Amino acid sequence: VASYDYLVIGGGSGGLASARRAAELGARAAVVESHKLGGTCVNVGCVPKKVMWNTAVHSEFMHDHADYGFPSCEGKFNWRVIKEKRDAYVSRLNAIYQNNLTKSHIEIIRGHAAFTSDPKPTIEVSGKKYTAPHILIATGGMPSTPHESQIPGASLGITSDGFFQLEELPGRSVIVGAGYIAVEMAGILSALGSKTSLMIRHDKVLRSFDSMISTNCTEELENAGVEVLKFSQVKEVKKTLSGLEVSMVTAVPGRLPVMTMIPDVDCLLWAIGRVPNTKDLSLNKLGIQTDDKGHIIVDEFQNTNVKGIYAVGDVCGKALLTPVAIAAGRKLAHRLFEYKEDSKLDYNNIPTVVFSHPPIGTVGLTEDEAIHKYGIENVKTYSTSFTPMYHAVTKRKTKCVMKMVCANKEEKVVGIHMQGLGCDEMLQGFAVAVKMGATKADFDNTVAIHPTSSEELVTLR
Amino acid sequence: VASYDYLVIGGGSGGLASARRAAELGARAAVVESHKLGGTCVNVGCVPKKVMWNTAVHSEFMHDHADYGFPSCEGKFNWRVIKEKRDAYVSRLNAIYQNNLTKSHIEIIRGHAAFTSDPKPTIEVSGKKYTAPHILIATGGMPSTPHESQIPGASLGITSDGFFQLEELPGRSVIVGAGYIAVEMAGILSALGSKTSLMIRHDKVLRSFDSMISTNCTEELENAGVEVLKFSQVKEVKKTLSGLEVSMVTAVPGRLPVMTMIPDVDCLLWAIGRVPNTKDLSLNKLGIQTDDKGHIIVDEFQNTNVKGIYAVGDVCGKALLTPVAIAAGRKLAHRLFEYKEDSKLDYNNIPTVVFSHPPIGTVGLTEDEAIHKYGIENVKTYSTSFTPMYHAVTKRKTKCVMKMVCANKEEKVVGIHMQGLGCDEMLQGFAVAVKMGATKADFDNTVAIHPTSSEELVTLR
């Protein structure tokens, strides 16, 4: 049993970030990874997704070419040209992160980890045992798929992972789900030329965001050509002579349910959720607590119910974002190796950007969350809706919507929500401001930058 | 002599903003304008400039088309197509601002104002006299041109105003000046196809910005194809059979001066400065103080040396930006009409964006200003230089540079400087944060947004 000061199971964002900060503090650490370093962020998530979003953005700009005085570009998008460049980029990143581990003197144990029945917390990787007084589980999650028991032929569809393996643009695609991944995938596929349908159980997408955003995002999708199939779900999928045939039930409230067949579908993408990766860890051997979904339960300091064992990242099921896994992982390293017992991540006011078209930026409470928390009498919102100056000379149009949620007499800014061109790079700074407890007065006392879309947030009345 | 509560001379940003806020407070106001409402911002500045910048941006993106899997666009940019759409847009804005004045019940006196020798401050517009207990001079400025006495043929060149009248793209252009207007013009002309040269007196552009920005901006210009003529100035200009011939002297320190002839120039644009518009106001008739350039002198409350007469905007010569004229104008209205004697604009931490390629964002002190103000021992800077992820798959490259200037033990953020894609919409929020007195810790405690360029500012080490 080789002993270390820190043993990290999982080589994705949470695992790498924590192991590296620990090593900086003098800890002898090792990272166990059964696949590719970089985890979801580098391999099947953030990075490849963003490259595809930049490609989709090129598509929209090509539509505005003639309006801006240029000749019209012909069209024919070549998927494998970008797929190949994207894969290469991911390869460069895997090499970079491996190098980052070596320079910090972090040992990389390649294989699948699983706990043993040994009294003191110990894991086994390919017949060898390893132990440490501090062990971090940062194994992440997977895309969830329906069981063939409830949805016959469900296994004919692909998940976000499968999306990154596609070597050709699907001519006809149906995305199932109403969360951010679904919206993002539908947005890229449609912009790139696929006949796209987004199938959602209710009437709007991103229903957990502020209502102004769910409403506006749903409309922008339709304006951009995406067919949103409302109150609809898949009943069954089957393989026909050319493509898949999807049977769906549409049940609009106050109407009779109707069955519809969607034929000649090239790509069915399930974007319905994420399942934690814990089933094969043998958690039970140490009695480590998990909820009924398989998420490891942790306290505010990322401690599990077992001493010396912690968890961060997607495996815990809360705030499933790369920067959150990273910050929690680093705060933990400082707590254990710099003895700062007050070191932990504040899960409040975590900013998020959804790479839709236009992108969405959000931080803080939605209007409904502020109302519940402070009371209708104490919540004041400010909003604006305008057409960005970029579209002043174009036939194609998009809108920019912004909303500020203030609380109490001082009008403390407790939430900012927006969708529009440039919102992806606009959010970070306002998030710093909200994290500092800015009031509407602080925003108003900052001189605006003209001409930009961002100046609208400091000139709301 | 018709009397009002507030008389505003000048219908640009400062004038409109102040008159409108005053009217809201119950004042009977009137605005005198000898030309087009909207002033520089709408007619020959911000608005038309931004439309041209968006057009230039389309040009650069067209260069990356093939790298992103698209067919190559042919090229031929048609200037008059965009010029015509741009003029129309400006026309829509003039109508909008006129309407804004009428709905607020603000009287518009069309004509050129000039003060009279009457004891109590009075002006005359087309034979009629007008007076008010509060009179605001917001007459702005003009582009400066060389006198034919020092530069023979100087009148053959055009200014930024003339740039907006051009009906065709100049094949060969030479821009003279090293400030933001010059950089912006050179950037648009070059991106759009003009053989462009930028002639500067020293070795770098924007020498009053942080050195990291002047250096980087100078390099980006050259990388984008702009010929920067260093230590050079025009000695004389003349009209030849086809174009202008510019004679310039290049005097590199430690070298002998050399005279060069630049032939077949289609467009010579003087972008050397701005002169205040006060010469025809008959200021002397009331003994209103001005510096030797013609700028009206004012105190922190925008008061001139004469009671009941104020000045805001470009005419005062400080912080020549639209949002500054507007904020100063509004603060003044509240001071006079809401009796808030503490109402005035804080000229510190005013953010600025230079619409270069990539754009530049800056707020606060440069490293040299912080050093002088706090002492070398108390100034710590953090910086990063990286290639945006957008260029991961392109042959063409641009860089993103960011710099944070902190002061004293607490590392108060006193300056942020950056150049890169998306920096135009990225600045506003950090400016709110700096205006609140954020320290490096506040930035560091804000969770990042991935993948974006803006997250680099909250993860500096």
Ligand SMILES: Cc1cc2nc3c(=O)[nH]c(=O)nc-3n(C[C@H](O)[C@H](O)[C@H](O)COP(=O)(O)OP(=O)(O)OC[C@H]3O[C@@H](n4cnc5c(N)ncnc54)[C@H](O)[C@@H]3O)c2cc1C
């Ligand atoms: C399509 C998609 C798009 C996304 N876009 C964004 C975005 O734009 N911005 C954002 O912030 N977030 C985004 N996310 C979410 C983000 O990717 C995750 O929140 C984050 O990567 C999770 O990090 P992690 O370290 O918890 O897990 P992971 O990155 O999944 O790391 C887990 C690692 O542990 C390894 N592992 C598992 N079990 C074992 C074992 N027993 N032994 C050894 N190794 C093991 C796995 O192989 C994997 O490499 C996206 C996610 C997806 C899927």
Ligand SMILES: Cc1cc2nc3c(=O)[nH]c(=O)nc-3n(C[C@H](O)[C@H](O)[C@H](O)COP(=O)(O)OP(=O)(O)OC[C@H]3O[C@@H](n4cnc5c(N)ncnc54)[C@H](O)[C@@H]3O)c2cc1C
């Ligand atoms: C090319 C260019 C690009 C710029 N880009 C930006 C940018 O992107 N962002 C930014 O913030 N700033 C920018 N600026 C600066 C900004 O335009 C000015 O700081 C601002 O418009 C000045 O407003 P003002 O009210 O002081 O003056 P002005 O807008 O010039 O208003 C003065 C008005 O008064 C009128 N007037 C003058 N004399 C009289 C008189 N005697 N009687 C009656 N009427 C009179 C004039 O006709 C004019 O309409 C730019 C400027 C230029 C020239």
Ligand SMILES: *SC[C@H](NC(=O)CC[C@H](N)C(=O)O)C(=O)NCC(=O)O
């Ligand atoms: S996509 C891989 C992840 N990278 C980023 O999130 C960049 C983070 C910033 N550079 C930062 O916080 O330093 C990832 O897995 N990062 C792990 C790491 O240790 O950088």
Ligand SMILES: *SC[C@H](NC(=O)CC[C@H](N)C(=O)O)C(=O)NCC(=O)O
């Ligand atoms: S280009 C004309 C100017 N407009 C802007 O600067 C927009 C300002 C914001 N909408 C705001 O502060 O409200 C201008 O001349 N504005 C004068 C005005 O009163 O809006």
